[PDB]
């Protein structure tokens, strides 16, 4: 069982970049993790290595004392974060996949295979937005660079009523509107 | 924790004593751009677009991992050999697109809260193993430093088949079988 599983010691190093407002704001944080414990880190906003837990003092002290290493780390905001952002700008940041909108019988509007993440899916009854009986799933990450989201509508079909699912996404200049009648 | 328009990991580095084994990959806004096969010493991009326009020196990954190994052994001692604690993983199965009998689809198996990063994810059809059309992502990072991984099974919806995503992990009391039907 879990108590007699093989012993494992795990190490993780995460070099992360944070981008806001295009290239206006850039921040990096490198994380040194033992098992699941982040014990030391470098935050470009702080400018020096800092111990996060009792395991980090020896590391943060030693690394801040290495002039070249310290300068190299501070310089990664440029050699890594800024440098790679330009590369994202010509590939990832331009990736656009239009959502496929489908409605099936209470009523489920399936918005599948889209990218980026930003989307707005709403239900309308006779061109009037539904404010209740609407439940959406969280944004679903497929792992293959596409997302999915399902929004259901609890309704009592009365004759003549026309239900529509409105979907807005950056890959679309015009909202996608799908109708459904009983 | 940190809010930003975009978050990237230009260095999800992993190394663990069990095996031993390691992993090197880059992620942007939660998805994997690539991973470096440490055996074949090659970079494997996850999108045709990337494979076509960008490149990464596998050696940087290999060199980084040797450093994580050096760091791990030292922290293992500084922590008096505190070993990783197994987390209980959670499994979820869903289709990539709406299910219409006869039309090609893909079953997705999300295995979340994985730790340590060692796991077996396999598929079952009508109770028996299936390897044809199966694939999976690398271990994707999480801010709490556990991981998640997604497996895929390309299939053709039919009334003659029911599936199961089987997950084996040291943290479980028994193998997990998450069922899914057309």
């Amino acid at each position: 069982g879990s108590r007699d599983s093989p012993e494992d010691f795990v190490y993780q190093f995460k070099g992360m970049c944070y981008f806001t407002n295009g290239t206006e704001r850039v921040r990096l944080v490198t994380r040194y993790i033992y098992n699941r414990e982040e014990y030391a880190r470098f935050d470009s906003d702080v400018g020096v290595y800092r111990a996060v837990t009792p395991l980090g003092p020896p590391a943060a002290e030693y690394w801040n004392s290495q002039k070249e290493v310290l300068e190299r780390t501070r310089a990664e905001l440029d050699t890594v974060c800024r440098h790679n952002y330009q590369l994202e700008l010509r590939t990832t940041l331009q990736r656009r996949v239009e959502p496929t909108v489908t409605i099936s019988p209470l009523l489920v509007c399936s918005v599948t295979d889209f990218y980026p993440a930003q989307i707005k899916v709403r239900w309308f009854r006779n061109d009037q937005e539904e404010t209740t009986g609407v439940v959406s799933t969280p944004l679903i990450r497929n792992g293959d660079w596409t997302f999915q989201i399902l929004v259901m509508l609890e309704m009592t079909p009365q004759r003549g009523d026309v239900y529509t699912c409105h979907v807005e996404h950056p890959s679309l200049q015009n909202p996608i509107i799908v109708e459904w009648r009983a | 924790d940190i809010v930003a328009d975009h978050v990237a990991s230009y260095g999800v580095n992993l190394y663990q004593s069990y095996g031993p084994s390691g992993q090197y990959s880059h992620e942007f806004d939660g998805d994997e751009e690539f991973y470096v096969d440490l055996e074949r010493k090659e970079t494997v991009w996850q999108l045709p677009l990337f494979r076509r326009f960008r490149r990464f020196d596998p050696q940087f990954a290999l060199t980084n991992i040797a450093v994580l190994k050096h760091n791990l052994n030292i922290v293992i001692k500084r922590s008096n050999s505190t070993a990783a604690t197994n987390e209980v993983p959670e499994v979820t199965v869903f289709s990539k697109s709406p299910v219409t009998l006869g039309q090609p689809n893909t079953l997705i198996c999300l295995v979340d809260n994985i730790f340590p990063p060692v796991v077996n994810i396999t598929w079952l059809s009508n109770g028996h193993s299936v390897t044809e059309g199966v694939s999976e992502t690398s271990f994707l990072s999480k801010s709490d430093h556990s991981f998640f991984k997604i497996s895929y099974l390309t299939f053709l919806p039919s009334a003659d088949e029911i599936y199961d995503c089987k997950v084996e992990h040291w943290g479980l009391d028994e193998p997990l079988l998450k069922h899914w039907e057309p």
């Binding site: 070099g15 990096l28 040194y32 020896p58 990664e76 050699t79 890594v80 590369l87 | 260095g11 990464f56």
Partner: peptide
């Protein structure tokens, strides 16, 4: 152009 990569600092034994 080559992709950038964060380089890990080395622990002192």
């Amino acid at each position: 152009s080559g992709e950038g990569s964060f380089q890990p600092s080395q622990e002192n034994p």
